[PDB]
Paper text:
Branching MT nucleation depends on recruitment of the MT template and nucleator, the γ-tubulin ring complex (γ-TuRC), to the side of a pre-existing mother MT to give rise to a branched MT with matching polarity to the mother. Both recruitment of γ-TuRC, as well as maintenance of polarity, are carried out by a conserved protein complex, augmin. Augmin is an eight-subunit protein complex first discovered for its role in localizing γ-TuRC to cellular spindles.
As the most suitable target for structural studies, we chose X. laevis augmin complex lacking the unstructured, poorly conserved 548 residues of Haus6’s C-terminus, a truncated complex which we had previously reconstituted and purified. Next, we performed 3D reconstruction and refinement to obtain a cryo-EM reconstruction at 6.9 Å resolution. However, we were able to establish unambiguously that augmin has a relatively uniform radius across its entire length, comprising a cylindrical density of ~40 Å in diameter. In general, the predicted T-II and T-III structures were in good agreement with the cryo-EM map, forming extended four-helix bundle structures that match the radius observed in the map. Perhaps unexpectedly, although T-II and T-III both consist of a core parallel 4-helix bundle and each is composed of a dimer of dimers, the global architecture of the two tetramers differs substantially. However, in contrast with T-IIIcore, in T-II paralogs do not form coiled coils with one another, but rather Haus6 and Haus8—structurally unrelated to one another—form a tight dimer that then associates with the Haus2/Haus7 dimer. Two T-II subunits, Haus6 and Haus7, both displayed a classic CH fold at their N-termini, which had not been previously predicted from the protein sequence.
Author numbering:
A (entry chain C): 254 to 353
B (entry chain D): 616 to 666
C (entry chain B): 549 to 597
D (entry chain A): 173 to 229
Write the structure that this text describes.
Amino acid sequence: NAEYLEAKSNALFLKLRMEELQVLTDCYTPEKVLVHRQIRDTLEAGVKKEKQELSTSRQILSSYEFLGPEFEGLVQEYTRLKDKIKDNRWMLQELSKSLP
Amino acid sequence: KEVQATVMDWWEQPVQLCLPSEERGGLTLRQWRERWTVAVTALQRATGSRS
Amino acid sequence: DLQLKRKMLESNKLQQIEKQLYVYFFQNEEQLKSIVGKLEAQTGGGSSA
Amino acid sequence: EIRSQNMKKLKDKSEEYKYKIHAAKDQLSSAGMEEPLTHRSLVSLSETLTELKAQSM
């Protein structure tokens, strides 16, 4: 009874493993493996480029963050002034279109 | 459960959606699958085919 | 489940080609244009009758 | 006695399954298939690229 239950357990498992591997061969044909390789290489090139843009952007930020809280207040004041000058220049541009 | 997931991956093939901004012939893969799906449904309507 | 999904793929040739569209997109753009364009031309020919 | 006869049939089928498992592994290897080229691996690689673009922006 012990030997019979062992043999039945092993036969059920091997049947399951065989069907999985047959689905994997039906999934990954040589033509698809080539396309999956092109997709991988395009994705890896993207991941590498973005890790490098992220690193450079963080280093420049840390150089400004070293100038302390009073500098960050002066930056906010200048940004608010530059936005107002841009709004006033845009208003002047719309009036001059209306003469023949 | 792993075998059932392998059967799902074979049935969905999810890799085809990993590059959405690639264009071939001025269209994305999704727009090509949509053109195909529209052409298949038009051909199934015209063939009177009771699916 | 596996016997059901294999019978679906053997019976429906259009579904089998749909599953290959992404292979044609990355390897052969003319063949993608030709396969989709043949299916579209077979639907459009109905106005000279 | 019935279980002993069925055990012989189960051992014979187990050897048949081991042979098909080997033939399927050899076919996968001949296709140049590697673990990073799987549907799961490439989707996980796409998801990690989208996460990085969100952090870069």
